[PDB]
Design a protein around this ligand. Sequence first.
Ligand SMILES: Cc1cc2nc3c(=O)[nH]c(=O)nc-3n(C[C@H](O)[C@H](O)[C@H](O)COP(=O)(O)OP(=O)(O)OC[C@H]3O[C@@H](n4cnc5c(N)ncnc54)[C@H](O)[C@@H]3O)c2cc1C
Ligand SMILES: Cc1cc2nc3c(=O)[nH]c(=O)nc-3n(C[C@H](O)[C@H](O)[C@H](O)COP(=O)(O)OP(=O)(O)OC[C@H]3O[C@@H](n4cnc5c(N)ncnc54)[C@H](O)[C@@H]3O)c2cc1C
Lengths: 240, 247
Amino acid sequence: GIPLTPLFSRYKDSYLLYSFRLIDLLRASTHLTKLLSSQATYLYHFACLMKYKDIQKYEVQQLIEWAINASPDMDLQQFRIEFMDKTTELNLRSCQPKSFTYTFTTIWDTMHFLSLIIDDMVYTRDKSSLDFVMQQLKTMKVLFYNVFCAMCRDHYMNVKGFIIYHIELIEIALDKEKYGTDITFVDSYNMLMKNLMAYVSMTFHNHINDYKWIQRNKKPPAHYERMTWGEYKKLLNLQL
Amino acid sequence: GIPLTPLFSRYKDSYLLYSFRLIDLLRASKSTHLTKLLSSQATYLYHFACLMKYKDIQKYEVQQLIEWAINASPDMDLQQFRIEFMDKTTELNLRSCQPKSFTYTFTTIWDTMHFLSLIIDDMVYTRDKSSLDFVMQQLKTMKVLFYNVFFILQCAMCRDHYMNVKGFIIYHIELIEIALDKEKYGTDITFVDSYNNMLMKNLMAYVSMTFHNHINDYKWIQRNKKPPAHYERMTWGEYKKLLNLQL
Ligand SMILES: Cc1cc2nc3c(=O)[nH]c(=O)nc-3n(C[C@H](O)[C@H](O)[C@H](O)COP(=O)(O)OP(=O)(O)OC[C@H]3O[C@@H](n4cnc5c(N)ncnc54)[C@H](O)[C@@H]3O)c2cc1C
Ligand SMILES: Cc1cc2nc3c(=O)[nH]c(=O)nc-3n(C[C@H](O)[C@H](O)[C@H](O)COP(=O)(O)OP(=O)(O)OC[C@H]3O[C@@H](n4cnc5c(N)ncnc54)[C@H](O)[C@@H]3O)c2cc1C
């Protein structure tokens, strides 16, 4: 369970937009097609699981085949219109983003969103199904690895391991639990920080913004605020 | 400077061995993509070897060694390459770059990584404020070496795994770039011993040690094997002692 805050609601919507922009690439692509659809399937299974308490395996598959077979000459506006029709026919309208304005915030929101999910999924885990969670975590690493502005892509390629590293810390903690050592949640960075991925993605996010001034060799603007853990836990109303 | 210790000694030789086994790969490069990726990697490796061995990068003597390697017979074996290597390094007055031992293992790779970490910490800590641009270029070179690690030995699992979490290391080098950039524009670095413009002294040594334990903690989840009760894990307390790291 994750509090339903205004920021979280934007996160939920950005996720849908991200997913839309992802499946739109299927036409443009092999190995990549397999990787893309595999990622789009997970993203959409989880969206349906959240909206319908069911992954809707058949409807989601129908969505992916369509996107994979959509006209590669079709532009984004047309792909959207057809996407709105297809999801409608499939009774997957709740998987449609409310907004289609795609920006860096869409990607950031998506990355923070996944972090919140990882935290919650891990915390509300069921010792009976630790294997399930770990499989979910493996998929999460893949989602983060493939998030890759040519400049941004190069930088991300170089430091995305910071995030993936922490997901592995989680895998380790979980593997210890399945073998006798329950986890001990603490709220500071077999112990694990609660809201770990939320803190790591916030930190990663600030770092990326700190570094860009170095890439651009141009000093920060006047009103250049920085996100603090204390203020972030508030916007998402995180539990300590 | 980096304190002389039995562990740092092994590090220096391993680094030269790793550097040697890497250039040995040029003569065998099948494509241009790899050739220049190997030559760049090999160039930076030797640059830093010459820095710790001659206090100078030896930019031009090294470009000759690389030139040679790249154009060495892809027919002879490692034993023969070693022979031609020793003579060329001699001819270019770079004998200090010849390895004492040729036993190549994962330890050789870890030692090389921990060596660079120690190098990063020293060059930053003993930096000259008027040539920060120089130190930052060195760090950029360091990120390239950590991004492009060649295992040379066989272990797909390792390659894929390092490909996934190497950013944890590079991320920290960028934190150092940020610290230096700040010093460049007015705020001097303030060193502390724990993990404004504060920066942990011996940061990369701490970062590399931690990354190393992590990798070793994770291989059990990878091989679904049970860790032996004797599993020894490196502590920062112990590591500092082994390298005579200064606080
Ligand atoms: C994966 C990725 C890599 C990037 N790499 C680069 C790069 O190499 N070079 C470059 O110039 N730009 C890069 N960017 C873009 C850059 O990070 C900013 O998104 C963009 O410059 C807009 O800046 P902003 O300050 O207006 O917005 P942002 O600060 O990005 O706004 C993001 C949103 O989240 C909030 N937020 C701000 N900081 C945090 C935080 N630390 N934690 C959580 N939420 C936060 C804001 O309130 C806002 O709603 C990257 C973007 C992504 C998604
Ligand atoms: C970058 C990299 C990635 C790897 N990825 C994998 C992988 O995915 N899966 C896998 O099974 N193996 C992987 N390995 C190999 C693995 O880490 C070990 O090298 C190997 O399993 C042998 O372990 P060992 O028990 O001999 O100890 P090693 O860890 O190899 O010991 C080497 C030396 O380092 C010292 N040392 C030990 N821990 C530390 C530390 N934390 N800090 C500093 N020195 C330390 C030891 O005292 C010893 O002298 C990787 C190796 C490298 C270099």
